[PDB]
Amino acid sequence: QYSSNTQQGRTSIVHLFEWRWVDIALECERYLAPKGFGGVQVSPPNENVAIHNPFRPWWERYQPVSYKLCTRSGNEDEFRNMVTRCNNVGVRIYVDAVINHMCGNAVSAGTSSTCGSYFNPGSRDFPAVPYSGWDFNDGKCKTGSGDIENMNDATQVRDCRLSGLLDLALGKDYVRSKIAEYMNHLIDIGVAGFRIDASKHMWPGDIKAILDKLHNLNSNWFPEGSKPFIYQEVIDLGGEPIKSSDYFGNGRVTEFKYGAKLGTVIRKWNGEKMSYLKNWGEGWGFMPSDRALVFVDNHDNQRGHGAGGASILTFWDARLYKMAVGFMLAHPYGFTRVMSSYRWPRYFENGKDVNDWVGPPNDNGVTKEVTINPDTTCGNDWVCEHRWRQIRNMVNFRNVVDGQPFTNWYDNGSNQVAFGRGNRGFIVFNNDDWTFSLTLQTGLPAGTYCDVISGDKINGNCTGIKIYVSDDGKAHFSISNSAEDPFIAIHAESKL
Ligand SMILES: [Ca+2]
Ligand SMILES: [Cl-]
């Protein structure tokens, strides 16, 4: 469950948040494959409640109605078409598995659902599965409300309703079997793994019992005996009874400490600075590198949901965001996930975004296609961070330097730092309020290299900055503190 099942030479996943299946399919062929992306995390592909107050929020997709593959992203044929076309160009699909719960206990009964399936939350009736009152934790939960009230009590965190979400009885073989049925449907279609939603709210042993029922990966695209990549959403910032390590038996775990700390560092908050990043990883109290799923932001915290945090960097803070993403993709710690977002009309009232609910760009509820502008950015309010040159090129940097040791570290004791990845890549950051001008040991073979942050290599030359590495491995770097992108990155494939 620990292996990503990506192609050799591809090393990141991109979250194409709320994208339609037909658009992801095209994106795999036209962009993700030729740019060396490892795979795509998709939004939950199972049928959910259609919530009209507020108007079709992104979070409706975290309220299941059935396991029919029928959502605003598309239907089953569209989903299957996407997985096939992506696998055929060597780009994997990872499904956001919403398996802790069905929908909110106060949602009205009826057919207000993405495939029109009937459901009755009040009577715990989900006939499209089917689930009944017998399949929920109502009798197991010990709280007065029936909801989670106290996260210091690990039992209620697992057995009670997360914010009123009907809590599936995952201790029951029947429930485990219906969930495995859904996950096996997806595996056989050709998915490579799963982001396990709300993993903290499930017993590690119940997750184990479900994973025991899972097939090996589709044997047309994957070597015999391949296991689904599992990464579990567990928010563990310390000081709680439940720990990320409790989930290591099932797969990788999201390291939410990563983005929280990196955001603080890059913002230069809390007395933190880039020179402190020399021992980034377990040295900062993080989980083992071989278990961490890392990211700067995710779909929750980029809008103040989840554990939120003021320090989180997002596309809204584009300059600092590119630096944080660049550092993450250059550094060997963890398995990397790049966020890809949509714009929404952010509006702050008494500290919070009152539009943090807004779903994807839509025409009266119908998700808008991703249009591609002539400059390769996206239209229709899709942000497409993964298409930003500075991020896309760092995704390839990580591929090129895969397996190479963290080496040749430099810092000025403040916010001017640099490091190499063996003899394959070198990166330089200036986050101080003065110019960084210095000759540094790069560890690289002598030659002329395109800076992949300011430009591209296009057979024979560079469209941005050129760096000249002398016979002894040294090169001069000049970065103004006023630079739009105050970092430079070079690697073996950017050499002329
Ligand atoms: Ca639960
Ligand atoms: Cl996540």
Curated annotation (Swiss-Prot):
Binds 1 Ca(2+) ion per subunit. It is an enzyme of class 3 (hydrolase). Ca(2+) binds at N100, R158, D167, H201. GO terms for cellular component: extracellular exosome; extracellular space. The active site is at D197 (nucleophile), E233 (proton donor). The keyword Disulfide bond applies. SMART domains: Aamy, Aamy_C. The keyword Zinc-finger does not apply. Its main location: secreted. Chloride binds at R195, N298, R337. Glycans are attached at N412, N461. The modification Pyrrolidone carboxylic acid is found at Q1. Disulfide bonds join C28-C86, C70-C115, C141-C160, C378-C384, C450-C462. It is found in: Secreted. It catalyses: Endohydrolysis of (1->4)-alpha-D-glucosidic linkages in polysaccharides containing three or more (1->4)-alpha-linked D-glucose units. Gene3D superfamilies: Glycosidases, Golgi alpha-mannosidase II. Monomer. Calcium-binding enzyme that initiates starch digestion in the oral cavity. Catalyzes the hydrolysis of internal (1->4)-alpha-D-glucosidic bonds, yielding a mixture of maltose, isomaltose, small amounts of glucose as well as small linear and branched oligosaccharides called dextrins. This is Alpha-amylase 1A.
